[PDB]
Design a protein around this ligand. Structure first.
Ligand SMILES: C[C@]12CCC(=O)C=C1CC[C@@H]1[C@@H]2[C@@H](O)C[C@@]2(C)[C@H]1CC[C@]2(O)C(=O)CO
Length: 120
């Protein structure tokens, strides 16, 4: 079980590291093909290809992230992240709470993201 936990954590490290690297090949491999992605604040729901498309656009805006905390609670993990994006020369700063559902290799089958824009 500790191995299970340790593997999930390592994968979330890979996720966020790949995000800062801009390596979407690595992101694609961590997500189940039938996974659903939820924007909690807008109630919008996306499939994997739609989610990755949005990631691509954000990476084009210099999206960078830093993980602040990881809490393991099917494995459910809550990650708090600070993120920045540069949009038409104006940087925007965000605090995001990402709650993942991993299902067994372990794959992400669901993410709910609460996104708050903090102001630069
Ligand atoms: C561009 C985005 C969605 C659209 C929006 O109005 C603001 C942002 C900035 C933060 C981004 C977010 C999504 O892309 C999901 C991201 C990457 C998040 C930072 C971490 C995030 O929740 C994830 O890493 C999810 O796996």
């Amino acid at each position: 079980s500790e191995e299970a936990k340790e593997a999930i954590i390592a994968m979330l490290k890979e996720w966020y590291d790949a995000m800062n690297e801009g390596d979407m090949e690595k992101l694609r491999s961590l997500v189940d093909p039938d996974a659903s992605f939820v924007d909690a604040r807008t109630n919008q729901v996306y499939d994997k290809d739609q989610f990755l498309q949005m990631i691509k656009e954000a990476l084009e805006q210099d999206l960078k992230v830093e993980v602040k905390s990881i809490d393991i609670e099917v494995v459910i993990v809550k990650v708090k992240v600070r993120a920045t994006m540069v949009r038409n020369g104006q940087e925007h700063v965000f605090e995001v709470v990402d709650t993942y559902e991993f299902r067994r290799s372990w794959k992400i089958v669901k993410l709910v993201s609460e996104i708050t824009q903090l102001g630069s």
